[PDB]
Amino acid sequence: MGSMERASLIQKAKLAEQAERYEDMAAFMKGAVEKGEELSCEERNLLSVAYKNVVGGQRAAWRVLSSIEQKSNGPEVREYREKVETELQGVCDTVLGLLDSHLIKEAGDAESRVFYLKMKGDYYRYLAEVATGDDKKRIIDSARSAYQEAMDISKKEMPPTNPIRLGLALNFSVFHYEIANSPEEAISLAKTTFDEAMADLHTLSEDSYKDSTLIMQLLRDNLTLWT
Protein backbone atom coordinates (compact mmCIF):
# COMPACT_ATOMS: atom_id res chain seq x y z
CA MET A 1 0.00 0.00 0.00
CA GLY A 2 3.11 2.11 -0.43
CA SER A 3 1.49 4.59 -2.84
CA MET A 4 -1.48 5.42 -0.59
CA GLU A 5 -1.39 8.21 1.98
CA ARG A 6 -1.26 7.18 5.64
CA ALA A 7 -4.42 9.16 6.42
CA SER A 8 -6.23 7.51 3.49
CA LEU A 9 -5.26 4.04 4.67
CA ILE A 10 -6.65 4.87 8.12
CA GLN A 11 -9.87 6.24 6.62
CA LYS A 12 -10.28 3.16 4.42
CA ALA A 13 -9.65 0.86 7.39
CA LYS A 14 -12.59 2.52 9.14
CA LEU A 15 -14.77 2.14 6.04
CA ALA A 16 -13.72 -1.50 5.67
CA GLU A 17 -14.78 -2.10 9.27
CA GLN A 18 -18.22 -0.63 8.53
CA ALA A 19 -18.48 -2.82 5.42
CA GLU A 20 -17.35 -5.92 7.39
CA ARG A 21 -14.40 -6.33 4.99
CA TYR A 22 -11.87 -7.43 7.58
CA GLU A 23 -9.18 -8.70 5.22
CA ASP A 24 -9.21 -5.29 3.54
CA MET A 25 -9.15 -3.63 6.97
CA ALA A 26 -6.08 -5.62 7.95
CA ALA A 27 -4.31 -4.81 4.67
CA PHE A 28 -5.01 -1.09 5.10
CA MET A 29 -3.73 -1.11 8.70
CA LYS A 30 -0.61 -3.11 7.70
CA GLY A 31 0.05 -0.40 5.11
CA ALA A 32 -0.44 2.28 7.74
CA VAL A 33 2.02 0.61 10.12
CA GLU A 34 4.58 0.28 7.33
CA LYS A 35 4.57 4.06 6.90
CA GLY A 36 6.91 3.95 9.89
CA GLU A 37 5.15 6.39 12.21
CA GLU A 38 3.95 5.40 15.67
CA LEU A 39 0.22 4.66 16.03
CA SER A 40 -2.26 6.60 18.12
CA CYS A 41 -4.59 4.83 20.58
CA GLU A 42 -7.40 4.76 17.99
CA GLU A 43 -5.08 3.49 15.25
CA ARG A 44 -3.72 0.69 17.51
CA ASN A 45 -7.30 -0.40 18.15
CA LEU A 46 -8.04 -0.44 14.40
CA LEU A 47 -4.97 -2.64 13.79
CA SER A 48 -5.97 -5.00 16.60
CA VAL A 49 -9.63 -5.25 15.54
CA ALA A 50 -8.72 -5.94 11.91
CA TYR A 51 -6.39 -8.83 12.68
CA LYS A 52 -8.53 -10.30 15.46
CA ASN A 53 -11.38 -10.63 12.98
CA VAL A 54 -9.18 -12.16 10.30
CA VAL A 55 -7.49 -14.64 12.59
CA GLY A 56 -10.76 -15.27 14.43
CA GLY A 57 -12.35 -16.52 11.23
CA GLN A 58 -9.30 -18.69 10.50
CA ARG A 59 -9.33 -20.16 14.00
CA ALA A 60 -13.05 -21.00 13.79
CA ALA A 61 -12.46 -22.72 10.43
CA TRP A 62 -9.41 -24.59 11.74
CA ARG A 63 -11.46 -25.86 14.67
CA VAL A 64 -14.25 -27.12 12.40
CA LEU A 65 -11.78 -28.94 10.15
CA SER A 66 -9.72 -30.31 13.06
CA SER A 67 -12.90 -31.76 14.58
CA ILE A 68 -13.90 -33.43 11.31
CA GLU A 69 -10.35 -34.77 10.93
CA GLN A 70 -10.28 -36.24 14.45
CA LYS A 71 -13.61 -37.97 13.84
CA SER A 72 -12.24 -39.37 10.56
CA ASN A 73 -9.39 -41.01 12.50
CA GLY A 74 -9.11 -39.84 1.94
CA PRO A 75 -6.45 -37.17 2.48
CA GLU A 76 -8.80 -34.26 1.74
CA VAL A 77 -9.74 -33.26 5.30
CA ARG A 78 -6.14 -33.25 6.51
CA GLU A 79 -5.01 -31.47 3.35
CA TYR A 80 -7.61 -28.74 3.77
CA ARG A 81 -6.99 -28.37 7.53
CA GLU A 82 -3.28 -27.98 6.73
CA LYS A 83 -4.06 -25.30 4.13
CA VAL A 84 -6.14 -23.28 6.60
CA GLU A 85 -3.47 -23.80 9.27
CA THR A 86 -0.73 -22.47 7.02
CA GLU A 87 -2.83 -19.40 6.18
CA LEU A 88 -3.48 -18.78 9.88
CA GLN A 89 0.22 -19.13 10.67
CA GLY A 90 0.97 -16.66 7.89
CA VAL A 91 -1.35 -14.04 9.35
CA CYS A 92 0.08 -14.52 12.85
CA ASP A 93 3.61 -14.22 11.45
CA THR A 94 2.61 -11.00 9.67
CA VAL A 95 1.25 -9.41 12.88
CA LEU A 96 4.26 -10.56 14.87
CA GLY A 97 6.48 -9.09 12.17
CA LEU A 98 4.77 -5.70 12.45
CA LEU A 99 5.22 -5.77 16.21
CA ASP A 100 8.91 -6.60 15.82
CA SER A 101 9.47 -4.16 12.92
CA HIS A 102 9.13 -1.83 14.62
CA LEU A 103 6.07 -1.15 16.78
CA ILE A 104 7.33 -2.52 20.09
CA LYS A 105 10.81 -1.00 20.05
CA GLU A 106 9.37 2.48 19.47
CA ALA A 107 6.62 2.08 22.12
CA GLY A 108 7.79 3.98 25.19
CA ASP A 109 4.56 4.89 26.94
CA ALA A 110 3.06 2.16 29.09
CA GLU A 111 -0.27 2.28 27.24
CA SER A 112 1.29 1.56 23.86
CA ARG A 113 3.94 -0.88 25.07
CA VAL A 114 1.49 -2.95 27.12
CA PHE A 115 -0.94 -2.92 24.17
CA TYR A 116 1.61 -4.29 21.71
CA LEU A 117 3.02 -6.88 24.11
CA LYS A 118 -0.49 -8.14 24.79
CA MET A 119 -0.88 -8.48 21.00
CA LYS A 120 2.41 -10.36 20.84
CA GLY A 121 1.20 -12.79 23.51
CA ASP A 122 -2.15 -13.28 21.73
CA TYR A 123 -0.60 -14.06 18.33
CA TYR A 124 1.93 -16.50 19.80
CA ARG A 125 -1.04 -18.04 21.64
CA TYR A 126 -2.85 -18.52 18.31
CA LEU A 127 0.30 -20.15 16.91
CA ALA A 128 0.42 -22.40 19.98
CA GLU A 129 -3.20 -23.51 19.44
CA VAL A 130 -2.15 -25.26 16.19
CA ALA A 131 1.44 -26.17 17.03
CA THR A 132 2.56 -29.81 17.25
CA GLY A 133 6.29 -29.99 16.46
CA ASP A 134 9.84 -29.29 17.61
CA ASP A 135 9.10 -25.63 18.42
CA LYS A 136 5.72 -25.96 20.16
CA LYS A 137 7.24 -25.51 23.62
CA ARG A 138 9.18 -22.50 22.34
CA ILE A 139 5.99 -20.97 20.89
CA ILE A 140 4.25 -21.34 24.26
CA ASP A 141 7.20 -19.77 26.05
CA SER A 142 7.20 -16.85 23.60
CA ALA A 143 3.53 -16.20 24.39
CA ARG A 144 4.18 -16.48 28.14
CA SER A 145 7.20 -14.16 27.98
CA ALA A 146 5.30 -11.46 26.08
CA TYR A 147 2.30 -11.61 28.42
CA GLN A 148 4.58 -11.58 31.46
CA GLU A 149 6.46 -8.45 30.38
CA ALA A 150 3.13 -6.76 29.64
CA MET A 151 1.86 -7.80 33.08
CA ASP A 152 4.95 -6.46 34.82
CA ILE A 153 4.60 -3.05 33.14
CA SER A 154 0.82 -2.87 33.70
CA LYS A 155 1.09 -3.55 37.44
CA LYS A 156 3.71 -0.81 37.80
CA GLU A 157 2.22 1.81 35.46
CA MET A 158 -1.58 1.43 35.25
CA PRO A 159 -4.44 1.43 37.77
CA PRO A 160 -6.10 -1.96 38.35
CA THR A 161 -9.20 -0.85 36.42
CA ASN A 162 -7.37 0.17 33.24
CA PRO A 163 -9.18 -1.68 30.42
CA ILE A 164 -5.93 -2.69 28.69
CA ARG A 165 -4.57 -4.04 31.97
CA LEU A 166 -7.85 -5.91 32.51
CA GLY A 167 -7.96 -7.39 29.01
CA LEU A 168 -4.31 -8.45 29.26
CA ALA A 169 -5.03 -10.26 32.52
CA LEU A 170 -8.12 -11.89 31.00
CA ASN A 171 -6.17 -13.17 27.98
CA PHE A 172 -3.18 -14.28 30.08
CA SER A 173 -5.60 -16.24 32.28
CA VAL A 174 -6.99 -17.92 29.15
CA PHE A 175 -3.41 -18.70 28.11
CA HIS A 176 -2.84 -20.38 31.49
CA TYR A 177 -6.08 -22.36 31.31
CA GLU A 178 -6.14 -23.38 27.64
CA ILE A 179 -2.47 -23.48 26.57
CA ALA A 180 -0.22 -23.90 29.62
CA ASN A 181 -2.36 -26.50 31.42
CA SER A 182 -2.32 -24.30 34.54
CA PRO A 183 -6.00 -23.94 35.51
CA GLU A 184 -5.17 -22.96 39.10
CA GLU A 185 -2.95 -20.11 37.88
CA ALA A 186 -5.71 -19.04 35.49
CA ILE A 187 -8.28 -18.95 38.30
CA SER A 188 -5.97 -17.14 40.73
CA LEU A 189 -5.07 -14.51 38.13
CA ALA A 190 -8.71 -13.94 37.20
CA LYS A 191 -9.83 -13.68 40.85
CA THR A 192 -7.03 -11.34 41.93
CA THR A 193 -7.56 -9.16 38.86
CA PHE A 194 -11.31 -8.95 39.48
CA ASP A 195 -10.96 -8.13 43.18
CA GLU A 196 -8.31 -5.46 42.69
CA ALA A 197 -10.43 -3.84 39.99
CA MET A 198 -13.56 -3.90 42.18
CA ALA A 199 -11.69 -2.04 44.92
CA ASP A 200 -10.62 0.70 42.47
CA LEU A 201 -14.01 1.34 40.81
CA HIS A 202 -14.82 4.14 43.28
CA THR A 203 -12.20 6.35 41.56
CA LEU A 204 -13.81 6.24 38.11
CA SER A 205 -16.22 8.38 36.15
CA GLU A 206 -19.44 6.84 34.85
CA ASP A 207 -17.91 6.19 31.42
CA SER A 208 -14.70 4.63 32.76
CA TYR A 209 -16.78 2.54 35.17
CA LYS A 210 -18.70 1.09 32.23
CA ASP A 211 -15.46 0.31 30.36
CA SER A 212 -13.89 -1.47 33.33
CA THR A 213 -16.96 -3.37 34.52
CA LEU A 214 -17.55 -4.81 31.05
CA ILE A 215 -14.20 -6.61 31.15
CA MET A 216 -14.63 -7.53 34.81
CA GLN A 217 -17.77 -9.40 33.77
CA LEU A 218 -15.72 -11.41 31.27
CA LEU A 219 -13.37 -12.35 34.13
CA ARG A 220 -16.35 -13.43 36.24
CA ASP A 221 -17.80 -15.40 33.31
CA ASN A 222 -14.59 -17.42 33.03
CA LEU A 223 -14.42 -17.95 36.78
CA THR A 224 -17.99 -19.26 36.71
CA LEU A 225 -17.06 -21.78 34.03
CA TRP A 226 -13.76 -22.79 35.69
CA THR A 227 -15.00 -23.16 39.28
Binding site: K14, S48, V49, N53, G56, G167, L170, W226
Partner: peptide
Protein backbone atom coordinates in the same frame (compact mmCIF):
# COMPACT_ATOMS: atom_id res chain seq x y z
CA UNK B 1 -13.24 -19.93 28.34
CA UNK B 2 -13.47 -16.54 26.70
CA UNK B 3 -10.70 -14.15 25.73
CA UNK B 4 -11.36 -10.49 24.84
CA UNK B 5 -13.62 -10.62 21.76
CA UNK B 6 -11.80 -7.59 20.38
CA UNK B 7 -13.65 -7.64 17.07
CA UNK B 8 -15.39 -4.23 17.04
CA UNK B 9 -13.63 -0.87 17.29
Amino acid sequence: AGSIPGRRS
